[PDB]
Amino acid sequence: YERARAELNQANEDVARNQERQAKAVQVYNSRKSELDAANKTLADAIAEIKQFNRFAHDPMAGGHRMWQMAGLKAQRAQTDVNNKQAAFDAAAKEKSDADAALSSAMESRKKKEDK
Amino acid sequence: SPDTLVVTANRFEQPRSTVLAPTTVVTRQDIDRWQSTSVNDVLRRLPGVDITQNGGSGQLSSIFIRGTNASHVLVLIDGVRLNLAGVSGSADLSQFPIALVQRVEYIRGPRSAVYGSDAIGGVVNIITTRDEPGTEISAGWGSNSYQNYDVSTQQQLGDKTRVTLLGDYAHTHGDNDGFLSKTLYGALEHNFTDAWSGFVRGYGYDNRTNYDAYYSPGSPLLDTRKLYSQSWDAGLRYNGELIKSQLITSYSHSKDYNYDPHYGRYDSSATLDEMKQYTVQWANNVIVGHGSIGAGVDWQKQTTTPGTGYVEDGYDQRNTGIYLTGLQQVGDFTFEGAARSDDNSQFGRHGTWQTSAGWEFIEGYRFIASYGTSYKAPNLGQLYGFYGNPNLDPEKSKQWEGAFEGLTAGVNWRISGYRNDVSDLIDYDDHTLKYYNEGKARIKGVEATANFDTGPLTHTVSYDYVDARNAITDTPLLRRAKQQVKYQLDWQLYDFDWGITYQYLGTRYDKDYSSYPYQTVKMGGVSLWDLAVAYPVTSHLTVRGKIANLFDKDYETVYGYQTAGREYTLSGSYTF
Numbered sequence: 001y002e003r004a005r006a007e008l009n010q011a012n013e014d015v016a017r018n019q020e021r022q023a024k025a026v027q028v029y030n031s032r033k034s035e036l037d038a039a040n041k042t043l044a045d046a047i048a049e050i051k052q053f054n055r056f057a058h059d060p061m062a063g064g065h066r067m068w069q070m071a072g073l074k075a076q077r078a079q080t081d082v083n084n085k086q087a088a089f090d091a092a093a094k095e096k097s098d099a100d101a102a103l104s105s106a107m108e109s110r111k112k113k114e115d116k
Numbered sequence: 117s118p119d120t121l122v123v124t125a126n127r128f129e130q131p132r133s134t135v136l137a138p139t140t141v142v143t144r145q146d147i148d149r150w151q152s153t154s155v156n157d158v159l160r161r162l163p164g165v166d167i168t169q170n171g172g173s174g175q176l177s178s179i180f181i182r183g184t185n186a187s188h189v190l191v192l193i194d195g196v197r198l199n200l201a202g203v204s205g206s207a208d209l210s211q212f213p214i215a216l217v218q219r220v221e222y223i224r225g226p227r228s229a230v231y232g233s234d235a236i237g238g239v240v241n242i243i244t245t246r247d248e249p250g251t252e253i254s255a256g257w258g259s260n261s262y263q264n265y266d267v268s269t270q271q272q273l274g275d276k277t278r279v280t281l282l283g284d285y286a287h288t289h290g291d292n293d294g295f296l297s298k299t300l301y302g303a304l305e306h307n308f309t310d311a312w313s314g315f316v317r318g319y320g321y322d323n324r325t326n327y328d329a330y331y332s333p334g335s336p337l338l339d340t341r342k343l344y345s346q347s348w349d350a351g352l353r354y355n356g357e358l359i360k361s362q363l364i365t366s367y368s369h370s371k372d373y374n375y376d377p378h379y380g381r382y383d384s385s386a387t388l389d390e391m392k393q394y395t396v397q398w399a400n401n402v403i404v405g406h407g408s409i410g411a412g413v414d415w416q417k418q419t420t421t422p423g424t425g426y427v428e429d430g431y432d433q434r435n436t437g438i439y440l441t442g443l444q445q446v447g448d449f450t451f452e453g454a455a456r457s458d459d460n461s462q463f464g465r466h467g468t469w470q471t472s473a474g475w476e477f478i479e480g481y482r483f484i485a486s487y488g489t490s491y492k493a494p495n496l497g498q499l500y501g502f503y504g505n506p507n508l509d510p511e512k513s514k515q516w517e518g519a520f521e522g523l524t525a526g527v528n529w530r531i532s533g534y535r536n537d538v539s540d541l542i543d544y545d546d547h548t549l550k551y552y553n554e555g556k557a558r559i560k561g562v563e564a565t566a567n568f569d570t571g572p573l574t575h576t577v578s579y580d581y582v583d584a585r586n587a588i589t590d591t592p593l594l595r596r597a598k599q600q601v602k603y604q605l606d607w608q609l610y611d612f613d614w615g616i617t618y619q620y621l622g623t624r625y626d627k628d629y630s631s632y633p634y635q636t637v638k639m640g641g642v643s644l645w646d647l648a649v650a651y652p653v654t655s656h657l658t659v660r661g662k663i664a665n666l667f668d669k670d671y672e673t674v675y676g677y678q679t680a681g682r683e684y685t686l687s688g689s690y691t692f
C-alpha cells in the first residue's frame with residue numbers, strides 16, 4: 001500500500017506546481033488584455049481622427065490636409081502597438097488554456113491516486 | 117532664344133534647333149531684368165506653366181505643367197532630381213533659393229525615356245553654374261520688409277583652375293518674420309587637359325519660414341519650419357570632338373523641422389523629415405553621321421529617417437536606370453528617340469520611350485510630330501504610410517504632339533497641340549482608408565508661342581489653352597487654369613532698360629474650404645501687369661527698380677489664401 005501513498009504525495013505536489021503555473025498565467029493574461037484594450041483604444045482614437053480630417057485628403061494645399069497625415073502617422077504607430085500587444089495576449093492566452101488543461105488533468109490524476 | 121545651346125534634352129550639349137520638343141531657356145541676364153525674387157516667379161512666365169501657392173515667398177506651392185499633376189513635372193538641379201521632392205514625391209521650388217539659379221532649361225513634353233520617373237508634363241532643369249568671370253555685390257529693399265544682400269565671384273585660381281563662390285541673405289514678411297533664406301555656395305573646377313576636366317562643389321541653405329497652421333486646443337501649434345539642405349557633387353567630364361562622357365556623383369542631405377517655438381524643435385510635437393539622396397550618373401555620347409547616339413546609367417538612393425514623410429519607419433528606396441539616345445538629321449527630315457529601363461527597389465522594372473521626327477518642308481518652316489510614354493513612381497506615404505499599399509504600380513502616361521514652327525518676317529513662332537492620356541493614377545479611397553491604382557486623365561491642350569522686334573522694342577508673347585479632365589467623370593481637374601496669356605515687353609530707351617510684363621490668368625475651380633460640405637466656386641480670371649526698370653549709374657553699378665502687381669489687382673491661386681498686392685522693389689548691383 002505504501003508504494004501508492006508516495007503516488008498521492010507526489011500527485012499533490014504536481015497540482016501544487018500547476019496551480020502556481022496557472023496563477024502566474026492569469027496575472028500575465030490580465031496584464032496583456034489590459035495593455036491591449038488600451039492600445040486598441042489609442043488606435044480607434046486615431047481612426048476617428050482620420051475620418052474627421054478625411055475630408056481634406058485629396059487636396060494637399062488645404063492645411064487640414066496636414067492634420068490627416070499626422071493622424072495616420074499616429075494611427076500607424078498605434079497599429080504597430082496593437083500588433084505587438086495582440087501577439088503577446090495571444091502568447092498569454094495560449095499559456096492560460098494550456099495551464100488550465102494541465103491543472104485540470106493533474107487533478108483527475110490526483111483524484112485517481114486519492115482512491116486510497 | 118533659338119540656336120543657342122542646351123544640355124537638357126539628351127544630357128549633352130546640342131543646338132536648340134536640333135531638339136524637337138519645345139524648349140524655353142532662361143538666363144541670369146533674363147532673371148536680373150525681371151528682378152525676380154524666387155524660382156516660382158521665373159517659371160510662372162513660361163509657356164504651359166501654371167503655378168499655385170498658399171501665399172507668398174517660402175509658402176507651399178505646386179507646379180502643374182500642361183495640365184498634369186503637381187507630381188508630374190521633373191525638376192532637376194544640374195541634371196539631378198531635386199532633393200526637396202524626395203519625401204513628398206512632388207516638386208516644391210518655393211524653398212529653393214533664387215540666388216543659386218543661374219540658368220533654366222525647360223523642355224515640355226515627356227522625357228522619362230531619358231530621365232526616369234516624374235518626367236510626364238515636362239522637365240525643369242535649374243542650372244547652378246555659369247561662366248562669367250568677375251565678382252558682383254548686390255542688395256535690395258522692398259515691400260513687406262524685403263531685404264537682400266548678395267555676393268558672388270568667379271576667378272582663375274590657376275588659369276586652368278576656376279573658383280566660384282556665392283553668399284546670399286534673403287528675408288521677407290507676409291506669419292511673423294516668415295521667410296529667411298541664407299545660402300552659401302562653393303565650386304572648384306579644373307582642366308586636366310583641353311578635354312579632360314573635373315569639378316567639386318558644396319552648397320547649402322538654411323531656411324526659416326512661418327505659416328498659417330490648423331489649431332487644436334491642448335496641442336502644440338506647428339507654425340514654424342526650419343529646413344537645412346546641403347548638396348555635394350564631384351565629377352569627371354570628357355569633351356572630345358567625337359566622344360563625350362560625364363561621370364557625376366552627388367549627395368544631398370536635408371533636415372526639415374516643423375515645430376512650435378514655445379515647445380522646442382526637438383520635442384515630440386515637432387515633425388522632422390531627414391532625407392539623404394545619393395546619385396551616380398555615367399552619361400556617354402558619340403557623334404554618328406549627322407547626329408549622335410547616347411547611352412547612360414543613373415543610380416539613385418534615397419534614405420529617410422523614422423517618422424519622415426509621415427511614415428513610422430525609415431526606408432531606403434533605390435533606382436537604377438539605363439537609357440539610350442538617338443539623333444540623325446537626314447536631308448530635311450530630323451529624327452530623335454530615346455529608351456529607358458528603370459529598376460525600382462519597390463516595383464521592379466518599367467521601360468519608357470519616345471520618338472519624334474520633324475521635316476523642314478519649306479526652308480524656315482518645320483512640322484514636328486511626336487509620341488512618347490512617361491511615368492511617376494509611387495511615393496513614400498503612398499507605399500508605406502497607414503494609407504499605404506506597397507504593391508502599387510507607376511502612374512503611366514502616353515503622350516502625343518503635333519507642331520508647326522516657322523520663321524517669317526523676323527518673327528519666331530510655334531502653334532502646337534498635344535494629347536496626354538495618363539493612367540493608373542494613384543488615388544486615396546475614403547471608404548477603405550487606402551491607396552490604389554484605378555484612376556485616369558484626358559488632357560488635350562494647345563500652345564502658341566511667338567516673339568519679335570518692332571522699333572527698339574522686343575516682345576515674348578505666348579498663349580496656352582489646356583483642358584485637363586478625369587477620363588471617367590469627364591469633368592475638369594480642379595485648380596488648373598483653362599488658359600493663360602503671357603506677354604513681355606522690352607525696351608532700353610535713353611539708357612533706361614524697361615520691362616512691362618503682363619499675364620492674364622484664366623479661370624480656375626478650387627474647393628471652398630469654408631462650408632462643409634465644400635462646393636466649388638469659380639475664381640475670377642484676372643489680368644496682371646508688372647513694371648520694371650534698370651539704369652547704369654556707372655559701367656560697374658546698375659540700379660534696378662520694380663513694381664509687381666502694378667494695379668493692386670488682387671486675387672488668389674489657392675482659394676482662401678491672400679496674394680501679395682502692389683509691391684515695390686528697389687535694388688542695386690555692382691560688378692567688377
Ligand SMILES: CCCCCCCCCCCCC(=O)CC(=O)N[C@H]1[C@@H](OP(=O)(O)O)O[C@H](CO)[C@@H](O)[C@@H]1O
Pocket residue numbers: 257258259260261262289647648649650660661662663683684685686
Ligand atoms: C522702376 C519703376 C518705378 C520705381 C519702382 C521702385 C520704387 C522703390 C520703392 C522703395 C520703397 C518701398 C516702400 O515704399 C515699401 C516699404 O519698404 N514696406 C513697408 C510698409 O510697406 P508694405 O505694406 O510692406 O509695402 O508696410 C509694412 C507694414 O506697415 C512693412 O511690412 C514694410 O516694412
Ligand SMILES: CCCCCCCCCCCC[N+](C)(C)[O-]
Pocket residue numbers: 281300301302303318319320346
Ligand atoms: C565662407 C567660405 C565659402 C566657401 C565654401 C562654400 C562651399 C561649402 C558649402 C558648405 C555649406 C554646407 N554647410 C551648411 C555644412 O556649410
Ligand SMILES: CCCCCCCCCCCC[N+](C)(C)[O-]
Pocket residue numbers: 280302303304316317318348349350365366367
Ligand atoms: C569651393 C571648395 C569646395 C570644396 C569641395 C570639397 C569636396 C566635396 C566632395 C563631394 C563629393 C560628393 N560625394 C560625397 C557624393 O561623393
Ligand SMILES: CCCCCCCCCCCC[N+](C)(C)[O-]
Pocket residue numbers: 265266267283284285298299300320321322
Ligand atoms: C554682402 C554679403 C552677402 C550676404 C552673405 C550671407 C552669408 C550667409 C550664408 C550662411 C549660410 C549658412 N549655411 C548653414 C547655409 O551654410
Ligand SMILES: CCCCCCCCCCCC[N+](C)(C)[O-]
Pocket residue numbers: 354356359360361400
Ligand atoms: C561602355 C560603352 C561606353 C563607353 C564610353 C566611355 C567613354 C569615355 C570617354 C573617354 C575617352 C577616352 N579617350 C580619350 C582615351 O578616348
Ligand SMILES: CCCCCCCCCCCC[N+](C)(C)[O-]
Pocket residue numbers: 352353354361362363
Ligand atoms: C568621364 C569619365 C570616364 C571614365 C572612364 C575613363 C576610362 C578611359 C581612360 C583610359 C584612357 C586614359 N588616357 C588618359 C590615356 O586617355
Ligand SMILES: CCCCCCCCCCCC[N+](C)(C)[O-]
Pocket residue numbers: 398399400411412413436437438457458459
Ligand atoms: C556607358 C553606359 C553603359 C552602362 C554602363 C554601366 C552598366 C550598369 C547598368 C546596370 C543596369 C541594370 N538594371 C537592369 C538594373 O537596370
Ligand SMILES: CCCCCCCCCCCC[N+](C)(C)[O-]
Pocket residue numbers: 404405409440441442443444451452453454455
Ligand atoms: C533612338 C534611335 C533614333 C535613331 C538614331 C539613328 C542611328 C543610326 C545611325 C546610322 C548611320 C551609320 N552610318 C555610318 C552609315 O552613317
